[PDB]
Write a protein that binds this ligand. Sequence first.
Ligand code: NI
Length: 258
Amino acid sequence: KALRPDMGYNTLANFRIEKKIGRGSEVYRAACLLDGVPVALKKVQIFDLMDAKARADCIKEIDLLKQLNHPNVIKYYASFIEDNELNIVLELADAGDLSRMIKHFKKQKRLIPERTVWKYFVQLCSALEHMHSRRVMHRDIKPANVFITATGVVKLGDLTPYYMSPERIHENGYNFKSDIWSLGCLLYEMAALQSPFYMNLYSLCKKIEQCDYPPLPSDHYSEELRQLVNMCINPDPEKRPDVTYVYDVAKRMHACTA
Ligand code: NI
């Protein structure tokens, strides 16, 4: 339809869809016509798959997400109902992700150097500390959801889970410490090019309660990095550190490995 300038990013009429870039919700690359800014436009059929209650929860959650504002977190520009669908307008992160980065290293048959691990991990910690400071849980930390722009800037992405924390396996509540568990698994994965517990939930539970994951090599990864992983993936959420402590370690290690 026709441009509605008063409406900012809150109406489909102010965007030109350029391409479908994802599906399964459907995701389009679009441009905001008011300012030429590129966006990801996600269309969710919340009336064909969502209960009255889940709809309010999902919406209240998106409203909390829109208040976020950080260079390392994907910006939620807007969300609105139109054409009987939920439309979420997101910062476009198009150039790649941590999952792809790890694949490059696997293909070149080499490990990610420690300094490179901290270079990206510290930015991820910055994102997550912003979120936790705003009292928002991420809930889906995984390499494919950690975008990396073309200039190597980390963008923590929009919210059978990739990393299953013990409390989630047994259907306890997801909380801030569950984010820390995924963050620890991710750090391990950057260093090992494989998830720590790479099956079924019962054998997964067994391995977790017995730290049955292969140690990282001490000749490539410092005690600092290895201990930080170890504490973040403690089975007991009370034993895991808060994001503020993880972030502080990341910043110290980034500063002296560079
Ligand atoms: Ni169990």
